[PDB]
Design an enzyme around this catalytic site. Structure first.
Site, PDB file in Angstrom:
ATOM      1  N   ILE A  83       0.835  -1.197   0.000  1.00  0.00           N
ATOM      2  CA  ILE A  83       0.000   0.000   0.000  1.00  0.00           C
ATOM      3  C   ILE A  83       0.872   1.250   0.000  1.00  0.00           C
ATOM      4  O   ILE A  83       1.718   1.412   0.891  1.00  0.00           O
ATOM      5  CB  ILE A  83      -0.893   0.066   1.284  1.00  0.00           C
ATOM      6  CG1 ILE A  83      -1.737  -1.194   1.455  1.00  0.00           C
ATOM      7  CG2 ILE A  83      -1.807   1.302   1.279  1.00  0.00           C
ATOM      8  CD1 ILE A  83      -2.428  -1.272   2.832  1.00  0.00           C
ATOM      9  N   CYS A  84       0.665   2.130  -0.979  1.00  0.00           N
ATOM     10  CA  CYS A  84       1.337   3.426  -1.003  1.00  0.00           C
ATOM     11  C   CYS A  84       0.449   4.421  -0.260  1.00  0.00           C
ATOM     12  O   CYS A  84      -0.568   4.865  -0.799  1.00  0.00           O
ATOM     13  CB  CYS A  84       1.598   3.863  -2.451  1.00  0.00           C
ATOM     14  SG  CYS A  84       2.463   5.458  -2.603  1.00  0.00           S
ATOM     15  N   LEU A  85       0.802   4.706   0.999  1.00  0.00           N
ATOM     16  CA  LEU A  85       0.028   5.616   1.864  1.00  0.00           C
ATOM     17  C   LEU A  85       0.998   6.333   2.803  1.00  0.00           C
ATOM     18  O   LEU A  85       1.748   5.689   3.516  1.00  0.00           O
ATOM     19  CB  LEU A  85      -1.004   4.824   2.678  1.00  0.00           C
ATOM     20  CG  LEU A  85      -1.870   5.611   3.671  1.00  0.00           C
ATOM     21  CD1 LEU A  85      -2.717   6.658   2.963  1.00  0.00           C
ATOM     22  CD2 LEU A  85      -2.758   4.667   4.494  1.00  0.00           C
TER      23      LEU A  85
END
Ligand SMILES: O=C([O-])C(=O)[O-]
Ligand SMILES: [Zn+2]
Ligand SMILES: [Zn+2]
Lengths: 146, 110
Positions: A83-85
């Site tokens: 997840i890119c967060l």
């Protein structure tokens, strides 16, 4: 870390974020499984998505490692479930909690960030042909998460 | 007096006889808890090239040694006792996970 993790566990047990759950995998307090119900304002509506959470030794000062286990079509989530967060990397703080992280992921499902993608083809489609994007995201939700 | 809120680092409240502190941005922490946070951030910043409040990001003023000298609070661990209702919910989740496996919907990572 352990006393902090027990405090969190009891608070998510009595007042979890809407439509989410979280708790230990078997006997191991440092490895949790979480669920998110797909938000109604997203092409993931109706799905139930499983995630894995692993707490580092120095929790709550370093971020938890959070990934999707359920396959999902999204510009910011890849085929490994990564997840890119920002709050899972550069923007983590110990004022945050697992409850707050689940809320943030729910928000990302409703509104992707396609200018910082993990999957360039999906980002391209999101930006040039949104109709095609929601169709494909609904298709994957129905096949894998329902 | 003693604050009525919670320390966001440890998630416990404040008791008389405990050592705690207040920041210029009006946030309370046990001295022990804040010392641990500051030590960690100093290390990260150095590896990159100014520690900010955990709550509001205002840059803090502090003396790390004075915070370290305070006694750690004695706080009994909160036992985990799943309710009957939570146990029922766990069973339903197990059924859903099994279907996803069958669909090829669970990522392996071998
Ligand atoms: O994503 C897939 O492989 C599909 O939709 O068949
Ligand atoms: Zn504390
Ligand atoms: Zn502050």
């Amino acid at each position: 870390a352990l006393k902090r993790i027990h405090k969190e566990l009891n608070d998510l047990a009595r007042d979890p974020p809407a439509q989410c759950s979280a708790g230990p995998v078997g006997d191991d307090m440092f490895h949790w499984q979480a669920t998110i119900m797909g938000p109604n304002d997203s092409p993931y509506q109706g799905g139930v998505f499983f995630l894995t959470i692993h707490f580092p030794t120095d929790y709550p000062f370093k971020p938890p490692k959070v990934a999707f286990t359920t396959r999902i079509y999204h510009p910011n989530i890849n085929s490994n479930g990564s997840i890119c967060l920002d709050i899972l990397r550069s923007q983590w703080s110990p004022a945050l909690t697992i409850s707050k992280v689940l809320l943030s992921i729910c928000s990302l499902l409703c509104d992707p960030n396609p200018d910082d993608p993990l999957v360039p083809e999906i980002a391209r489609i999101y930006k040039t042909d949104r109709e095609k994007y929601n169709r494909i995201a609904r298709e994957w939700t129905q096949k894998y998460a329902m | 007096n003693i604050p009525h809120g919670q320390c966001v680092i440890c998630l416990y409240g404040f008791q008389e006889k405990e050592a705690f502190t207040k920041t210029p941005c009006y946030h309370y922490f046990h001295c022990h808890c804040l010392a641990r946070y500051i030590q960690h951030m100093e290390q990260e910043l150095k590896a990159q090239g100014g520690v900010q409040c955990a709550v509001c990001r205002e840059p803090l003023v502090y003396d790390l040694a004075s915070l370290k000298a305070a006694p750690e609070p004695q706080q009994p661990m909160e036992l985990y006792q799943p309710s009957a209702e939570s146990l029922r919910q766990q069973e339903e989740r197990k059924r859903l996970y099994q279907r996803q496996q069958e669909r090829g919907g669970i990522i392996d990572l071998e």
